[PDB]
Amino acid sequence: LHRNSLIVLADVALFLALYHFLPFEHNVVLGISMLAFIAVLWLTEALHVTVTAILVPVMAVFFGIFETQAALNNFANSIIFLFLGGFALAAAMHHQGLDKVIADKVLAMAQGKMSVAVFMLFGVTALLSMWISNTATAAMMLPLVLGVLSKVDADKQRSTYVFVLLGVAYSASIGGIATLVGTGPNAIAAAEVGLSFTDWMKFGLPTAMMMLPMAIAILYFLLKPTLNGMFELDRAPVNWDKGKVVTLGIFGLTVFLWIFSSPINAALGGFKSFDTLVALGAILMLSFARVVHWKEIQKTADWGILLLFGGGLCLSNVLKQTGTSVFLANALSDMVSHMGIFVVILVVATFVVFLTEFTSNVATTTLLIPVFATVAEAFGMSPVLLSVLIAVAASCAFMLPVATPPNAIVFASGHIKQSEMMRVGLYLNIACIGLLTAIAMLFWQ
Amino acid sequence: LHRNSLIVLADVALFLALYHFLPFEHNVVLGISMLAFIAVLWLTEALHVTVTAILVPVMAVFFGIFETQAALNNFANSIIFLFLGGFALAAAMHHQGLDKVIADKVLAMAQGKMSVAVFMLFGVTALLSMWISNTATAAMMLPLVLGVLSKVDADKQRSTYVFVLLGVAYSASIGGIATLVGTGPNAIAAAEVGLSFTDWMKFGLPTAMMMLPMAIAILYFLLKPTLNGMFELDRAPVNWDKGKVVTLGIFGLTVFLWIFSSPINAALGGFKSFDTLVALGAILMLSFARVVHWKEIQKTADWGILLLFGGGLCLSNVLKQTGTSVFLANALSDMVSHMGIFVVILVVATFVVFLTEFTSNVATTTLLIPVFATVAEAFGMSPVLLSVLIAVAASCAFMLPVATPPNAIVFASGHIKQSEMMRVGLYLNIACIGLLTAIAMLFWQ
Ligand code: NA
Ligand code: NA
Ligand code: NA
Ligand code: NA
């Protein structure tokens, strides 16, 4: 009777149709029929993203592609645990309130000026986003933004107070493209192609450094009247208490090990997923040092996403095993040889940057990385380039809300118009397709 | 400076001491040193049970026993997912309120008598416990018990109103020993020895049927003045609404498949962990039928326990790989041949039943099943017997609180004395060591 129940039933119909009607070797038919079924479910979201992720192994198994245990093993991938270490690290500095003090210490550096208030609001949002999450950083920044935008209160003076709301909503998304922890898509890329923490930072951080100024400049050069205003530093000040220096101490130590993983691990005997161990070592240090309880981590951890990760890895392996990856490469062979590498990565970048407006970031990456990376491997090219690209471009959701929660968070502020965001995003989207295709070209040789 | 930080430091010392001072083949030294370290941490609970579980792979990897990924793979065991299916099934019928209606429909069968009120309170607690959890079933039953024990309100008339509080606190623990979902220890046994859902029910259910009357009879024959009293059916009645018949429908279908798994799977082509697939199929049916959202399951699911499971499976594999399992069998060889099989299982049963009073049920099972099962295998005997025994006896916590949350739940009722529970438990403990050793003997040939 419901909308989504029909989408699912239409999909069951579609699968059945593709299964009985495609003219190929049985394995490829099954692989294509599955890929379409799952592609629908993750884009429409008729079933919850994670329910769909669970549906993958259960299909793979029932259709004899993998044995039950083999399929489930996907969910214990070392990157998944790295990301859990991220959640525990976040959980710690949120319960401790080290995120609050980083906001105040930097916000009060601005004596009382609105010009150097919002420029220090975006800089903190993105810095805090590197380690925490996007949705979490947005929900945490909202009250701190509304607090500052109450002196220039006049909402007939909207464009002073919309530049700042839409500004952090993007700064949360751009801050994610910095490190391996931060947003889901990055983790999915790293798991697929086998990236280290320091590897994804070499790609991502420069792109964040490039993108944040570029994004503000676009918001600025639309309708900003913010060179005027005064401050209202209204609430109790902050101070380093029982081991906020300790949480920062562990955090610092962890990040130090993550960056210097290459020489530290090499000169340690070369353990396998060193970054994952570090991330679990973090969970251990935070508990021995007593700085955060487990119940806290169990609330903060998004087990839904953790499961989603493995759901996509299962899919990736479904594509290989059925030979669907190689069949698609064969079908695209003529098209891709006719296309220049510039043309390809421009088409890819454009495809995601706009697709990501309709569906969740992860939901699109969890679908697209498997397809592209495995097809890239059939072409015998390094699946890294396309993957990192997709992972970054997925986090470029700037147009409507429902694209990312950070967009819907600053939108529920019952103030910003649908039309307004839709056109700043349409500019920033094109701006990014440029920047990415540019940087993706530069990172070739 | 804290108590537990010293326990941990004392343990780090102990490990270091055992590591540098034991006179054996390096692998066995490492295996022994690890086993002692982890044993301490799970019994003292200096670190949280789950933090300790994570510590296992991280040690195994750093001490070259397993490669990072191989060790983590333990956490994706098919039983863990079976148990997650249990959590989702519970989450459904709690959010739907199918547990409430099962309480009222059976409680109102008793017209208005206290004699047939509490006897129908224990019967519901245990039946509801089979599928839900122990801690969850206790916290859910508490208000429903205090509601009935307000007509015979006189708390100078204590023993009418302590027989019922301590009655359900046990009925929750005995109800767990019924099926594979229900309590952690059962799942740990099944994962270690490879049991089906219908397999553990053949052991457990008869034991629950035997134990519940035996437990009441002991509480009854101490200080019961409950053949007197009247009812107060005070609150809004219940009625089957939008698919509480559907949740029961799915639940019923799931349990039907679980019981009849053997012939259904056999006549289906023999899929690998059929019970796990059923449990995931449950998660899928519950979502397509829209009866429960995912956020609900993410709250209900105890991801801490889910992780604990794999922590112990990692340990089990640590014992084998280092050859510590075989070394212990050699050391115990003389002792066990001098002991009769009756003697052994009486010693084992007594050991756990009393050990489980000091530490969490899972925490003790997660420690003991690996040691015993793997040693049993070195002796070339089926590790099932000892394991199922340990798993059942672990759920026999009847003395103090802090033994199980269901004990601490009915204790926070600021009414029941420490001394009171301690001696009913001491009787029921001995009563059980009997029943188990009896049934364990009968289930031989
Ligand atoms: Na982020
Ligand atoms: Na998106
Ligand atoms: Na239970
Ligand atoms: Na216990």
Author numbering:
A (entry chain A), B (entry chain B): 18 to 462
Quote the passages of the study that discuss this structure, keeping the authors' original sentences:
Membrane transporters belonging to the ubiquitous divalent anion/Na+ symporter (DASS) family move Krebs cycle intermediates or sulphate across the cell membrane typically by utilizing the preexisting Na+ gradient.
These data implied that T379 is not essential for the succinate transport and NaCT may also interact with a trans-dicarboxylate. Although VcINDY and MT5 interacted with succinate similarly, pronounced differences between them were found in the extent to which citrate inhibited the transporter-meditated uptake of succinate.
